[PDB]
Structures are given as structure tokens and as C-alpha cells.
Amino acid sequence: TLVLRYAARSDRGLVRANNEDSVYAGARLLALADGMGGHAAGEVASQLVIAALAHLDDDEPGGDLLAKLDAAVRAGNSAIAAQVEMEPDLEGMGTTLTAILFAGNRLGLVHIGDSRGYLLRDGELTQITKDDTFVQTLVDEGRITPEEAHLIMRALTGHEVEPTLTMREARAGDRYLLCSDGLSDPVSDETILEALQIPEVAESAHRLIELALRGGGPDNVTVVVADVVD
Numbered sequence: 001t002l003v004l005r006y007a008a009r010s011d012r013g014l015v016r017a018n019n020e021d022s023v024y025a026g027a028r029l030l031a032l033a034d035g036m037g038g039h040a041a042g043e044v045a046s047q048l049v050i051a052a053l054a055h056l057d058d059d060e061p062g063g064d065l066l067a068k069l070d071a072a073v074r075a076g077n078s079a080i081a082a083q084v085e086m087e088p089d090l091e092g093m094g095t096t097l098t099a100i101l102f103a104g105n106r107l108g109l110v111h112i113g114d115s116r117g118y119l120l121r122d123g124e125l126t127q128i129t130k131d132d133t134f135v136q137t138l139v140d141e142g143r144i145t146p147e148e149a150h151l152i153m154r155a156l157t158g159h160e161v162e163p164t165l166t167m168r169e170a171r172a173g174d175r176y177l178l179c180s181d182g183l184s185d186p187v188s189d190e191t192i193l194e195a196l197q198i199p200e201v202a203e204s205a206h207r208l209i210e211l212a213l214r215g216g217g218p219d220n221v222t223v224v225v226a227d228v229v230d
């Protein structure tokens with residue numbers, strides 16, 4: 001009945017030595033993880049988490065999306081702990097994670113960190129995740145302006161943490177964007193909305209990467225654009 005058309009793109013950017021973002025996109029699961037750590041232990045962290053989510057794409061659909069998602073993330077976060085325990089040569093490594101799991105006309109959203117999920121629906125663009133950062137707290141509390149908001153952040157580091165989990169409606173015509181801060185830091189939401197207007201999902205995704213890079217590509221930039229269609 002309802003199906004996804006998706007496009008994932010990731011680029012190292014114009015500055016960073018390695019790409020510490022990891023991404024997955026398939027017919028049921030979209031997922032993105034921005035890793036961090038000394039010596040690109042951070043590609044390790046982001047891969048471990050994506051690797052623990054992957055099975056949700058091909059597993060028999062669906063059932064309790066949030067619970068599956070919650071379990072997947074906890075599993076990724078235990079892998080990271082195990083990694084750190086086996087080499088304090090990885091101490092402090094971690095990753096953000098934003099993922100969506102689809103089933104029929106519902107979806108589960110799981111999030112922790114400063115990667116983002118957005119919905120384009122009936123011509124409006126909304127951010128369906130909230131950055132888990134000190135700056136976000138400050139702006140929410142009117143303590144700094146949104147502009148001064150242009151680190152200190154929740155992350156999967158192997159220490160137990162519950163991410164945010166939200167069940168939502170998946171509607172024919174929805175367009176979903178997942179992105180790392182390497183997109184949303186250099187590129188405003190008005191410009192992202194423009195790119196999200198491009199019909200073909202691959203070309204929209206390609207445009208976003210191009211726009212981050214035109215913006216100086218200061219960080220790894222990763223996107224998944226996806227449509228819910230009849």
C-alpha cells in the first residue's frame with residue numbers, strides 16, 4: 001500500500017580528514033549517525049550503531065516500532081561500551097543517532113544528539129527532532145538568540161541513556177529529511193526547504209550535499225531524503 005523512495009548521500013566535506021558519519025537507507029529503515037572520538041574512533045562508533053539498526057530494515061514488519069528501535073539503539077550503545085572496554089584507546093568515542101522505522105502509515109522516530117529529522121508535509125517544513133545540546137536549551141529558554149545559536153551534547157558513548165522515541169503518522173506525499181550537523185550548520189532551513197522541493201529524491205539529496213559544500217563543507221555532511229508514496 002504505502003512505500004518509501006529514498007536517497008542517501010554522505011560526503012567528507014572540504015576540511016575533515018575522515019568521514020565519521022554513517023548512514024543507512026532502505027525500504028523500511030532510514031538512519032544516520034554522526035560519530036566523534038580521538039583518531040577517527042568516531043567512524044567506529046557511528047558504524048557500530050548503524051550496524052545494530054540494520055536488521056530492522058529486513059526483519060518481518062512490523063509490530064512495536066518504538067520498542068524495536070529502542071532495543072536496536074541500546075544494542076549499538078552496548079557495542080560501543082564493549083569497544084571502549086577493550087581499548088581505552090577509544091575512551092570518549094561516541095555518536096549521535098537519528099533513525100526512522102516505517103510500517104504502513106505509521107513510523108517510529110528515535111533520536112539522540114544534534115543530527116536532525118525534518119518533515120516536509122503540505123508545503124510546510126518542520127523539524128521533528130530537537131537538538132540535544134546546551135545551545136538548544138539556551139535558545140529554548142531565550143537565554144541566547146537563535147542567530148547566536150548559528151560539543152556539549154547527548155551522545156551514545158557506551159554509557160546507558162534513553163534516546164527520544166516518537167510514534168508518528170506516515171502520510172502519502174510526506175517528504176522526510178535526516179541530516180548530520182554538516183548540513184544544517186552551514187545551510188539554513190529556508191535553503192533546505194528549497195532543495196526539498198526538487199521532485200526526484202536522489203537529486204534533492206545531491207543538492208543538499210552540494211549546498212553544504214558550497215557553504216564551505218566545514219564538517220562531514222550526510223543526508224537521507226525519502227518520500228512516502230502510493
Ligand SMILES: [Mn+2]
Nearest residue numbers: 020034035036
Ligand atoms: Mn562527527
Ligand SMILES: [Mn+2]
Nearest residue numbers: 034181182219
Ligand atoms: Mn558533524
